[PDB]
Design an enzyme around this catalytic site. Structure first.
Site, PDB file in Angstrom:
ATOM      1  N   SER A 249      25.333 -37.955 -13.919  1.00 15.41           N
ATOM      2  CA  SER A 249      25.842 -37.266 -15.133  1.00 15.41           C
ATOM      3  C   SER A 249      27.352 -37.219 -15.265  1.00 15.41           C
ATOM      4  O   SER A 249      27.885 -37.080 -16.377  1.00 15.41           O
ATOM      5  CB  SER A 249      25.277 -35.891 -15.254  1.00 15.41           C
TER       6      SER A 249
ATOM      7  N   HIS B 151      18.421 -36.327 -17.515  1.00 15.89           N
ATOM      8  CA  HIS B 151      19.342 -36.927 -18.458  1.00 15.89           C
ATOM      9  C   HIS B 151      18.824 -38.200 -19.129  1.00 15.89           C
ATOM     10  O   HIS B 151      19.615 -38.950 -19.748  1.00 15.89           O
ATOM     11  CB  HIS B 151      20.711 -37.192 -17.785  1.00 15.89           C
TER      12      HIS B 151
ATOM     13  N   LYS C 140      17.569 -29.857 -21.764  1.00 17.06           N
ATOM     14  CA  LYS C 140      18.309 -30.980 -22.313  1.00 17.06           C
ATOM     15  C   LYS C 140      17.595 -31.534 -23.534  1.00 17.06           C
ATOM     16  O   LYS C 140      17.518 -30.836 -24.534  1.00 17.06           O
ATOM     17  CB  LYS C 140      18.669 -31.997 -21.226  1.00 17.06           C
TER      18      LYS C 140
HETATM   19  C1  LIG Z   1      20.796 -30.064 -15.834  1.00 16.04           C
HETATM   20  C2  LIG Z   1      20.265 -30.376 -14.483  1.00 16.04           C
HETATM   21  C3  LIG Z   1      19.591 -29.449 -13.674  1.00 16.04           C
HETATM   22  C4  LIG Z   1      19.403 -28.022 -14.054  1.00 16.04           C
HETATM   23  O1  LIG Z   1      18.592 -27.770 -15.127  1.00 16.04           O
HETATM   24  P1  LIG Z   1      18.584 -26.367 -15.862  1.00 16.04           P
HETATM   25  O2  LIG Z   1      17.255 -26.425 -16.538  1.00 16.04           O
HETATM   26  O3  LIG Z   1      19.697 -26.275 -16.777  1.00 16.04           O
HETATM   27  O4  LIG Z   1      18.572 -25.300 -14.801  1.00 16.04           O
HETATM   28  C5  LIG Z   1      19.047 -29.903 -12.451  1.00 16.04           C
HETATM   29  N1  LIG Z   1      19.214 -31.214 -12.064  1.00 16.04           N
HETATM   30  C6  LIG Z   1      19.885 -32.094 -12.865  1.00 16.04           C
HETATM   31  C7  LIG Z   1      20.112 -33.516 -12.409  1.00 16.04           C
HETATM   32  C8  LIG Z   1      20.442 -31.680 -14.031  1.00 16.04           C
HETATM   33  O5  LIG Z   1      21.053 -32.493 -14.748  1.00 16.04           O
END
Ligand SMILES: *Cc1c(COP(=O)(O)O)cnc(C)c1O
Ligand SMILES: *Cc1c(COP(=O)(O)O)cnc(C)c1O
Ligand SMILES: [Mg+2]
Ligand SMILES: [Mg+2]
Lengths: 398, 398
Positions: free
Chosen positions: A185, A213, A244
């Site tokens: 990311s 992602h 997301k």
């Molecule tokens: C965004 C993300 C998380 C956390 O997710 P949330 O639902 O916001 O707690 C965990 N691992 C990865 C790779 C992320 O991108």
């Protein structure tokens, strides 16, 4: 001195940043949100280009109607754990939607993605077992390692060779979990999953891939980078989030392993927290199901990403990737001052992007991270490019 | 053998329980929820008496309207961290509501209560510092200890003397956090906070009190057991949840410490997760504000609890408490079989309560845990007592 004296450094650092005249990037408030791509910040209409709302689902009319209907029918919350009184109709629905989305027999939803990673890593790998992860893995993955009792084995970032060498030195018998992310990311580049999974399998490890992602826009079914790279049926566990592409809050892990759902019986972050509100699991269900076939959105997302990536690079910005490989476009700047000046000029001009500086990024790395949305219009993307050209000049990037 | 082989024991244990003919207590689904006190389970209208919806807020019309309005105006989710793009209007509102509710200058909201405990404990106490907690503390408190790098000091359950002796043996200089719960949830008894806080202060420790099971119905302002026990102004940090009295999901910590909100800059479970959906923080805001003055509800809750506690004890059930000290009434049974038979007979007769057996409880402790709601009617409470009498007889408690 007391327990908060340890924060004196962070407090001083923040004040130094504010002394430059910049808006506090950690205190931005979206006063109004008109759509997935427009908000009012500091009283100013602003284009949003720093959210993970990849598929614009947060204002989808089916998603919104499902949320309202769930509030009306089931109330605001469950007031209990999934293991007791907190499993309503819609919790069963959302786990079935994930089974259908990923083509798996197993699906376990958590109250956040952070908790899904915390829980699944600390629960699957015990004493005498190994968790093997990329040096630059998400914080929640490291926190899952810290929460558990396994031996932790970091490998050099993005290095198939170091994964192979480090795995090869471990004793053969103990069970092992290799944890990978499909999209890195920070810069928006893609992991070499095909090669890393082959290495993991050669060493008899189980594989967990985080596809937070990529959901809805990689692979024929939108399952993620692993699907795009032909690994369907080869991934033991896929972890994701509802925050997301799905457009709410929550976490999950899916699997075809016959014993998978026995994880509910052991997993502390699953057991010892309230289940999600009915409206949250209803919006997630609807959104996930629509994501299965959101072809127009997918096409727009990728069209937008290619236009933004191509335009910024042509202008002369240094990007984190040579080609448009994800819906994250990272602009690399020379120093902290340049990044802050750029960020502020963009904000003042009506555009919000994320800034990332140390210690969020490695020392020497200063970023503006743009994240594209299916619902950005070609007009907005050109407006954004114009804004980047204007700011890049006033600041002297470019 | 693989990573899931460690679950073979739990899988076998579950199957043994099912072999008795009992409904799986860990797979109950609320198919419909008519109100805070009525649901449809297994196609049967059922009184709910095993939820933490103490103040019946989940169907409050103001709470529901706030949630729907937030979905309409701000969408289904924020798609980002509080430190980036995830702070909307309603997040600022909910933190101000907590400041007003508790009379504090500081308030930090997390995405779950579990994460608030995980984060605040692991962030406040570092290497060379001490976290001192009751042997029988909530899982999230133990998980916060495990997540951090502090020295962990357990004291004998409910023992002011052991707290004092254990604290006294620690070196004087390092900072210390004593973590206490106002209500011991297993049995529904109350901690001797006045005495424990005096002991903590004598030793120069900071104090964190969890008031998850008291919110809205202990103390003149409904702030919790610490307020009821006259400790206003003496508690360094109060942790709570949105999932119980408030009726949604989320966690928080409040404080008057001048550096408190610098915790946002360091706290990994605050930083590395998406903020809560607009509807969740809007329902929480409304609910918290109503809880400040929900006098009719408070009175009903306590009236109901006293009637249930008094009726079960008079029948001859052994309860976890001699007097009605909280909104949890715990019925203690002789063995696992008795508890399961009682639970099943109640369920089949139209009443849901929580069953707790080892390893949820200590070996030798087998419970039916009833949790009362402001919205139970005197009629429902008598119906419940009738059901307990009928089941207690068929099973042979009583
Ligand atoms: C965004 C993300 C998380 C956390 O997710 P949330 O639902 O916001 O707690 C965990 N691992 C990865 C790779 C992320 O991108
Ligand atoms: C319920 C509870 C928690 C967890 O809260 P959630 O919001 O459900 O995650 C933490 N501590 C105590 C004492 C609790 O009772
Ligand atoms: Mg609008
Ligand atoms: Mg209804």
């Amino acid at each position: 001195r007391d327990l908060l004296s340890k924060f004196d450094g962070l407090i001083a650092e923040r004040q130094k940043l504010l002394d430059s005249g910049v808006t506090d990037p950690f205190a931005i408030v979206m006063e109004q949100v008109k759509s997935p791509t427009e908000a009012v910040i500091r009283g100013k209409d602003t284009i949003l280009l720093g959210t993970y709302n990849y598929m614009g689902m947060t204002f989808d009319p089916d998603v919104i109607a499902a949320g309202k209907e769930a509030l009306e029918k089931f109330g605001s919350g469950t007031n209990g754990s999934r293991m007791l009184n907190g499993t309503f109709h819609d919790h069963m629905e959302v786990e079935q939607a994930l089974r259908d989305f990923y083509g798996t027999t197993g699906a376990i939803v958590f109250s956040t993605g952070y908790m899904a990673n915390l829980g699944i890593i600390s629960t699957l790998a015990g004493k005498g077992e190994y968790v093997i992860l990329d040096a630059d893995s998400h914080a929640s993955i490291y926190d899952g390692c810290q929460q558990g009792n396994a031996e932790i084995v970091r490998f050099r970032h993005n290095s198939v060779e170091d994964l192979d060498k480090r795995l090869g030195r471990l004793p053969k018998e103990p069970a092992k979990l290799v944890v990978l992310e499909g999209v890195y990311s920070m810069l928006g580049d893609i992991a070499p999953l095909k090669e890393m999974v082959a290495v993991a399998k050669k060493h008899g490890a189980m594989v967990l891939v985080d596809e937070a992602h990529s959901m809805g826009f990689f692979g024929p079914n939108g399952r993620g980078v692993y699907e795009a790279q032909g690994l369907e049926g080869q991934i033991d566990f896929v972890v994701g989030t509802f925050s997301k592409s799905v457009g709410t809050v929550g976490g999950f892990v899916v699997s075809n392993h016959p014993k998978f759902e026995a994880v509910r019986l052991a997993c502390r972050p699953y057991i010892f927290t309230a289940s999600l509100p009915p409206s949250v699991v209803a919006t997630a269900t609807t959104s996930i199901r629509k994501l299965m076939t959101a072809h127009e959105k997918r096409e727009r997302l990728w069209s937008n990403a290619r236009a933004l990536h191509g335009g910024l690079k042509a202008m002369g910005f240094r990007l984190g990737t040579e080609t448009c490989d994800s819906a994250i476009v990272a602009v690399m700047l020379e120093d902290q001052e340049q990044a802050a000046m750029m960020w502020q000029a963009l904000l003042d001009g009506g555009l919000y992007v994320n800034m990332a500086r140390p210690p969020a990024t490695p020392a020497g790395t200063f970023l503006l991270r743009c994240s594209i949305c299916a619902e950005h219009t070609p007009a907005q993307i050109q407006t954004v490019l114009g804004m980047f050209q204007a700011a890049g000049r006033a600041v002297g990037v470019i």
